From a paper:
GSK256073 binds both HCA2 and HCA3 but is 100-fold more selective for HCA2. In this work, we determined the cryo-EM structures of human HCA2-Gi complexes bound to the HCA2-selective full agonists GSK256073 and MK6892, the partial agonist LUF6283, and the nonselective synthetic full agonist acifran to investigate the molecular mechanisms underlying HCA ligand recognition and activation. The acyl tails of GSK256073 and LUF6283, and the aromatic ring of acifran are surrounded by several hydrophobic residues (L832.60, W91ECL1, M1033.28, L1073.29, C177ECL2, F180ECL2, and F2767.35), which form hydrophobic and van der Waals interactions with them, and fit into the ligand-binding pocket. Purine-2,6-dione of GSK256073 is larger than the furan ring of acifran or the pyrazole ring of LUF6283 and has a tighter contact with those residues than acifran and LUF6283, resulting in a 100-fold higher potency. Because the Gi-binding interfaces of the 4 HCA2-Gi structures are almost identical, the GSK256073-bound structure with the highest resolution was used to examine the selectivity in the following section. To assess the functional role of the potential ligand entrance, we performed MD simulations of HCA2, with and without GSK256073. The distance between L1584.56 and W1895.38 was essentially the same as that of the initial structure for about 900 ns in the presence of GSK256073, whereas under ligand-free conditions, the distance increased. The structures of HCA2 and HCA3 can also explain the selectivity of GSK256073. Replacement of W91ECL1 in HCA2 with Ser shifts F2777.36 closer to the ligand-binding pocket in HCA3 than in HCA2, and the distance between Y872.64 and Y2847.43 in pocket II is slightly closer. These results show that the narrowing of pocket II causes steric clashes in the purine-2,6-dione part of GSK256073, supporting the previous report that the affinity is 100-fold lower for HCA317.
The hydroxycarboxylic acid receptor (HCA) family consists of the typical metabolism-sensing receptors present in humans and belongs to the class A GPCRs. Here, we present cryo-EM structures of human HCA2-Gi and HCA3-Gi signaling complexes binding with multiple compounds bound. Agonists were revealed to form a salt bridge with arginine, which is conserved in the HCA family, to activate these receptors. Extracellular regions of the receptors form a lid-like structure that covers the ligand-binding pocket.
Residue numbers in the entry:
A (entry chain S): 5 to 120, 136 to 245
B (entry chain A): 6 to 54, 182 to 234, 239 to 354
C (entry chain B): 2 to 340
D (entry chain C): 8 to 63
E (entry chain R): 9 to 300
The structure:
């Protein structure tokens, strides 16, 4: 589990925190993906395992600072110039990278704060009929083919059920995440991708986001509500 | 390659922990402890402080590792190369079992084991520390029993000084490689001290010889 | 004096088997494969060198994906390698550094190791809570652990220096079956491709074919003059090769119940430490004490290549299930990937 | 002591009462298996350099 | 006779015995030194598998010794012409740098070797015995730097001095003046002697206080500790004692008569040709006489 942060502040500065619990936090790289009140998700910052490489979003490159404390198992985000364009619900995401790992596998609860080139993923469809028991398919596309020379396409599928954090379904566009029922399936061709649900149940409703992981300024697709 | 680059720096973080642990491991002295079971190795282990037993002790800012393999009871030559690289071998022989039998008397069982270990192909230069234990019992036993029971060719007075020095010479005579390996023989009392110092001195001579190997002198 | 009668009966019983074995020896393997084309000189280059072990490497095992492998060494570390990018996927510290064998689960979620501690430890690779942790410690052997091989995700078979092999149930940790009949230490084992039978060479210079289900010895193969150090099953599943301390290798046929070909050379006086077949079964690769892994034409019993890239004794050997590489560990603390 | 001798004899008889085939029948199977999979062995027949996962 | 060199009254002699003595001596040292250090250097790079801190320091000694050997033909060509230098001015300043700096390089990387062995016998558990190969290479750089920094001023010294009908190059001139390069020559010997002799004495005493001398291979290494302390004295004492007598003559007689220096000047450059005897004996003593 993980959580933490502050909520209310005017134009100024604030610091967020995340408290990891029981997953060997020292060997996990952590992210700070955020979500606007009714837009889609957007990545913010990243700090690697052992506090090596650190990356930031282009829109918060100078104002934001991300740091971790491996003892006491805490992750921090320092924000200095808090404009009105950055009021959002900020999530904490864990991700580990070796040969066959599943990054972005766990997402935090998230906290809201208010103030009072790149690859674009389209996800053209926005809403579909909610009739259950059918075989609903969700499409996606990318500006450039995210198929690397090592042979895997870095496309991730997330499902955000109404009222809770996003949950990873498929990583690298074909691999099914642990604990996810075998109804979900993922197919693609480098540029155009698909997520298939065989027999949709009552718990499959919500927004389905697509994420890329080829070049590190990584971006989402604004979602596809059901 | 964003995931490939994050995997490469995970391996490099593994690399430095492997090198950190190797630095710590090289600062420990590894000793192999042998004997005939009832030879008093338990007493020797207590002095310094199934499967294979590891004992940890320190002396003068030096870290020692003693491995006891007396519970194997298997073919020794199939696992004796695992210890090729120990600083020294601590061999324990009880002086009070010259007349006791296992048939074959217990003392000649140790001599058979000592001869096999000393002349092993894997131990051609490792120092052997020989501990002759139970010197109290042997001193009293020779008064009522003669050493001729164990050694029929023995011709000497049944005194502690003459008889004990004869047993040691018999053990040191089994060393065929008299020029490339040194055997340190010590007489151990069941209730005494300064046995850990004797191991430290014999280990230091091995370290000095190891240092001269690196500098090219020896 | 029933002991004298029983001993005399066994000697006649043993001679009857030898007569039956000699009866079926219609010809030799060399004569049958005398018309086959020689494999010719075979050259393999070190495509990769895996560094990071700081002591002698005693065991390695490939994963079924032909990309990941695990290696053991006496620095107390079990390292999982990425054989394509040389990356270190995992580094597992062992409780006892005296490790003599490695196994990779065919599922890929577990590895096993054991040695002078008389214990086989099972490690869970796919843990949701971060790192790699130990799962089950299988205790019950009286001697050291010489080999271990996963039958499935829940069943493992181990050989020990107490002259017995055992079949375990990892969930409960109890010996389902005990395989007895060897008089010397069992140094190796090799599961059949169908995972129903397995062979085991021992220090009594004899190899025994066992049945996992029933739990009794089926055949006993002799002919070696010293300890059998390595054993491996032919890809077909009806034959196996042995590597012994008399600097010789032998091929035994399960159905014919006798040795077929001998892989020896007068120039070699060092015993074999490991054997392994290629994917086709035409090549038999053996690791020797003379620092060189030798490649044998298994059908013709001719030397075909040398893997001379190590500065110490080649302790372990391996061939991928894809058959596209050979990994060779040795006492110089390096693993080399060939061709 | 007598039981161990009897047990060894009983197992020795079981290994005797098994079915065997001629070597030429068993040797031809290894000959047949090797030639059937001669094209699928990368070590026996080196695959094209572009297909090596370890060369490049 | 007499020569005015850079505002000191200095005396310069041109003896006929120099031509018939020094070129023979320096010729034998050059060929054997080329075979000794040249072959030794190849073994370090292309015949040695492992490298430790001790072997790195022995490599720096061979590097300094080898570079000094190749400068001998320039010295030989200067003496066959009886102190007539006809190679130029800049090349003259360069060799004086390549001789004085190279002579410390050999001397510095054998006091280091002597101290290195002292810590391997008398303090076998010290941390200095386990310094990394990178730490050894760093120290060899600082020791080369102090070697260079103590001889750069030789290049700045304009010394293509004309002597009658011959151009003469030399950093060793007999005249009443305090020169750092003259006190350089003394400290090259006395200070290392207080370390080489001390380190060699404690190594032998410690190997005897413990009964380690009984081993045949250890007693072989005991002699080679003595040998390096004797070759150093043999090859460096004759030049140092002669130069001290020259200093004594200046203080008690003076430069008013440059005739009393006829014999010492001839002898000094004969003894100075023995300081290169060490540079070619080192490969036989330090590298070729090692079991490894
Ligand atoms: C460049 C030649 C000058 C001749 C005098 N000279 C010297 O100035 N420095 C020396 O080291 C040296 N060695 C020998 Cl023999 N002659 C030497
Ligand atoms: C050289 O000697 C003369 C006579 O003693 C003296 O006057 C002169 O100062 C000396 N030159 C130098 C540079 O000392």
């Amino acid at each position: 589990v993980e959580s933490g942060g502050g909520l209310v502040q005017p134009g100024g500065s604030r610091k967020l925190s995340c408290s990891a619990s029981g997953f060997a936090f020292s060997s996990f790289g952590m992210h700070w993906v955020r979500q606007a009140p009714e837009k889609g998700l957007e990545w913010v910052a990243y700090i690697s395992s052992g506090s090596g490489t650190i990356y930031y979003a282009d829109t918060v490159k100078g104002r934001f600072t991300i740091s971790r404390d491996d003892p006491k198992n805490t992750l921090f985000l320092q924000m200095t110039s808090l404009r009105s364009e950055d009021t959002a619900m900020y999530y904490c995401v864990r991700s580990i990278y070796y040969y066959g790992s599943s990054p972005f596998d766990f997402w935090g609860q998230g906290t809201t704060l208010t103030v009072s080139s790149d690859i674009v993923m389209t996800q053209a469809t926005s809403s579909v009929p909610v009739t259950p028991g059918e075989s609903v398919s969700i499409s996606c596309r990318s500006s450039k083919s995210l198929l690397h020379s090592n042979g895997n396409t870095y496309l991730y599928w997330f499902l955000q059920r109404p009222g809770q954090s996003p949950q990873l379904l498929i990583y690298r566009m074909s691999n099914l995440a642990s604990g996810v029922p075998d109804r979900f399936s993922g197919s693609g061709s480098g540029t155009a991708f698909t997520l298939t649900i065989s027999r949709l149940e009552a718990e499959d409703v919500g927004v389905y986001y697509c994420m890329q992981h080829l070049e590190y300024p990584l971006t989402f697709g604004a979602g596809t509500k059901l | 390659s964003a995931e490939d680059k994050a995997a490469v720096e995970r391996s490099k973080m593994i690399d430095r922990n492997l090198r950190e642990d190797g630095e710590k491991a090289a600062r420990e002295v590894k000793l192999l402890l042998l004997g005939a079971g009832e030879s008093g190795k338990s007493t020797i282990v207590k002095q310094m402080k199934t499967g294979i037993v590891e004992t940890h002790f320190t002396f003068k800012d030096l870290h020692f590792k003693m491995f006891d393999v007396g519970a194997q009871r298997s073919e020794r030559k199939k696992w004796i190369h695992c210890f090729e690289g120990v600083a020294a071998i601590i061999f324990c022989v009880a002086l009070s079992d010259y007349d006791l039998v296992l048939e074959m008397n217990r003392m000649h069982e140790s001599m058979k084991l000592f001869d096999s270990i000393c002349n092993n192909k894997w131990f051609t230069d490792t120092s052997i520390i020989l501990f002759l234990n139970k010197k109290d019992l042997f001193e009293e036993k020779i008064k009522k029993s003669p050493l001729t029971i164990c050694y029929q060719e023995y011709a000497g007075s049944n005194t502690y000084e003459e008889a004990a020095a004869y047993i040691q010479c018999q053990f040191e005579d089994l060393n065929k490689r008299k020029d490339t390996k040194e055997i340190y023989t010590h007489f151990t009392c069941s209730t005494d001290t300064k046995n850990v110092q004797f191991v430290f001195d014999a280990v230091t001579d091995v370290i000095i010889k190891n240092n001269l190997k690196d500098c090219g002198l020896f | 004096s029933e002991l004298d009668q029983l001993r005399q009966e066994a000697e006649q019983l043993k001679n009857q088997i030898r007569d039956a074995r000699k009866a079926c020896a219609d010809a030799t393997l060399s004569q049958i494969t005398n018309n086959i084309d020689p494999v010719g000189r075979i050259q393999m280059r070190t495509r990769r060198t895996l560094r990071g072990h700081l002591a002698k490497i005693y065991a390695m095992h490939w994963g079924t994906d032909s990309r990941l492998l695990v290696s053991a060494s006496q620095d107390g570390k079990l390292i999982i390698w990425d054989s394509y990018t040389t990356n270190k996927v995992h580094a597992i510290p062992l409780r006892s550094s005296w490790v003599m064998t490695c196994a990779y689960a065919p599922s890929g979620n577990y590895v096993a190791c054991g040695g002078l501690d008389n214990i086989c430890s099972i490690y869970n690779l796919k843990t949701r809570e971060g790192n790699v942790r130990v799962s089950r410690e299988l205790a019950g052997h009286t001697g050291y652990l010489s080999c271990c091989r996963f039958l499935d995700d829940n069943q493992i078979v181990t050989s020990s220096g107490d002259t017995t092999c055992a079949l375990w149930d990892i969930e409960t940790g109890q010996q389902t079956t005990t395989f007895t009949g060897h008089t010397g230490d069992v140094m190796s084992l090799s599961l059949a491709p169908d995972t129903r039978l397995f062979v085991s060479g021992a220090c009594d210079a004899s190899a025994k074919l066992w049945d996992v289900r029933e739990g009794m010895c089926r055949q006993t193969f002799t002919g070696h003059e010293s300890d059998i150090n390595a054993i491996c099953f032919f890809p077909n599943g009806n034959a196996f090769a042995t590597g012994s301390d008399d600097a010789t290798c032998r091929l035994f046929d399960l159905r014919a119940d006798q040795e077929l070909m001998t892989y020896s050379h007068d120039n070699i006086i060092c015993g074999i430490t490991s054997v392994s077949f290629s994917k086709s079964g035409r090549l038999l690769l053996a690791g020797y004490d003379d620092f060189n892994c030798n490649v044998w034409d298994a059908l013709k019993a001719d030397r075909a290549g040398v893997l001379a890239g190590h500065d110490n004794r080649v302790s372990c050997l391996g061939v991928t299930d894809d058959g596209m590489a050979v990994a060779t560990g040795s006492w110089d603390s390096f693993l080399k990937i060939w061709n | 002591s007598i039981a161990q001798a009897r047990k060894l004899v009983e197992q020795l008889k079981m290994e005797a009462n098994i079915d065997r085939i001629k070597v030429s029948k068993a040797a031809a199977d290894l000959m047949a298996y090797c030639e059937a999979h001669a094209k699928e062995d990368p070590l026996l027949t080196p695959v094209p350099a572009s297909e090596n996962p370890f060369r490049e | 006779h007499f020569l005015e060199i850079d505002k000191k009254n200095c005396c310069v002699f041109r003896d006929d015995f120099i031509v018939k003595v020094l070129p023979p001596v320096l010729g034998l040292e050059f060929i054997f030194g080329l075979l000794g250090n040249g072959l030794a250097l190849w073994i370090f790079c292309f015949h040695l598998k492992s490298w430790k801190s001790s072997r790195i320091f022995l490599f720096n000694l061979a590097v300094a010794d080898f570079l000094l050997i190749i400068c001998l033909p320039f010295l030989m060509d200067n003496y066959v012409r009886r102190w007539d230098w006809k190679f130029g001015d800049i090349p003259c300043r360069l060799m004086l740098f390549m001789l004085a700096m190279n002579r410390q390089g050999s001397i510095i990387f054998l006091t280091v070797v002597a101290v290195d062995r002292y810590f391997r016998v008398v303090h076998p558990h010290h941390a200095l015995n386990k310094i990394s190969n990178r730490t050894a290479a760093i120290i060899s750089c600082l020791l080369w730097g102090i070697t260079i920094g103590l001889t750069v001023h030789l290049l700045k010294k304009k010394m293509p001095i004309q002597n009658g009908g011959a151009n003469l190059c030399s950093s060793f001139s007999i005249c009443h003046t305090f020169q750092w390069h003259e006190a350089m020559f003394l400290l090259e010997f006395f200070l290392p002697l207080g370390i080489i002799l001390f380190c060699s004495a404690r190594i032998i005493w410690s190997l005897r206080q413990r009964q380690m001398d009984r081993h045949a291979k250890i007693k072989r290494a005991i002699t080679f500790i003595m040998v390096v302390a004797i070759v150093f004295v043999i090859c460096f004492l004759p030049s140092v004692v002669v130069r001290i007598r020259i200093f004594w003559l200046l203080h008690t007689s003076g430069t008013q008569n440059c005739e009393v220096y006829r014999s010492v000047d001839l002898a000094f450059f004969i003894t100075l040709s023995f300081t290169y005897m060490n540079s070619m004996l080192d490969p036989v003593v330090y590298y070729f006489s090692s079991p490894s």
